[PDB]
Design a protein around this ligand. Structure first.
Ligand code: NA
Ligand code: NA
Lengths: 218, 218
């Protein structure tokens, strides 16, 4: 029984990831801003009982790792998954975006995910996996982000920070994944990403992969 | 006689680029926050006479394209070079950076450069070149940004936005360059980048290159 921490597990792929890991026999620690006000998560929690724990926690708060920390207690994290991404302004227009919006977009999509993962890094199992929800829109080589440039740039920044983190170690103590979930049901996506996550266990590599475990170019 | 616009031309590579293009026989329009308080630019201006025009202009202001616009008049831009770039916080620490700092770093290094270039795009000659000062630190493949992750991420975001812009056209109307200046004197770097810029003229390609016109991987 591996311990899996999902930050952003209230709805969508996050909730799907929690279900997919539960089905693989993991102990799952689900973090969300308002866990009680997600009917999906609550119902998932009440099926399988103690094996899914809901935790209040906002990635954007500076006390987030501490709240997760005291809650975990002594147990180590085998799989850490940071799923907290926003689109940015609807218009995705560089001419219209203000400072507040810029701060929010890059804090939420890039900076805060690294802040959390670094704070918890000491508690992740050696040969475990730390994975971040990214996007194919982050890929410079693919250059597919014309219709949502600000979103794609926020995710390129995420990818950059994660590659930079890998650059700090002589050898990685765990794997660093950047995940493209696809756009395809939530269940198909989640099942695939879990497979991709589990494939990286014990390899201690930095990879950018989709829900099929295919390498995306940077 | 080609018209060359350099945004950020008071000091460093910017000033070097202005000199390098002047020596190749161009009409050069230099923009800077404080043109009068740069002894280099003033002395460069006085040597070339009318062939170098200094203009007050801050890339981060929303009226910047308008000020450049009225000043150019009807003249088309053959080469547009956006030379902006700040380091970000000294500590380069995701755990310490606030909203103000985040806004400033991504506005300055990524968003404002695209805002300006897009606003002036209509006035760039077809088969001309729009170039942005980037960094080898933007390269995910090279992964050299461990010691300055926020800087590198800001530049990866720049690269992303430029690739996204390329993605809007069926075929590019001009070249989109991302330049690594290579830290080597200002004159050697500037001469090389000018060669790289001029090599892209008439090709209408998106390229990430250094001062030797060598491709950097994304
Ligand atoms: Na926003
Ligand atoms: Na420095």
């Amino acid at each position: 029984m591996h311990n899996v921490l999902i930050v952003g597990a209230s709805r969508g792929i996050g909730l799907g990831l929690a279900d997919a890991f539960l089905q693989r026999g993991a102990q799952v620690f689900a973090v969300a801003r308002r866990p009680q006000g997600s009917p999906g998560l609550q119902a998932l929690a009440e099926r399988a009982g103690e094996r899914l724990q809901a935790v209040t926690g906002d990635l954007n708060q500076h006390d987030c790792a501490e709240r997760i920390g005291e809650m975990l207690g002594e147990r180590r994290i085998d799989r850490l998954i940071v799923n907290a991404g926003i689109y940015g302004p609807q218009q995705q227009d560089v001419a219209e975006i203000d400072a507040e919006q810029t701060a929010q977009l890059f804090l939420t999509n890039a900076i805060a995910p690294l802040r959390l993962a670094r704070a918890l890094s000491g508690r992740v199992s050696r040969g475990g996996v730390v994975a971040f929800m990214s996007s194919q829109m982050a890929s410079l080589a693919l250059g597919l982000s014309a219709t949502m440039p600000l979103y794609g740039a926020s995710k390129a920044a995420l990818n950059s920070l994660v590659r930079s983190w890998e650059g700090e170690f002589e050898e990685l103590p765990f794997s660093l994944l950047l995940l493209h979930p696809g756009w395809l049901s939530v269940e198909e996506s989640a099942a695939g990403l879990v497979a991709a996550v589990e494939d990286a266990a014990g390899v201690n590599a930095c990879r950018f992969v989709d829900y099929r475990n295919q390498p995306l170019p940077w």
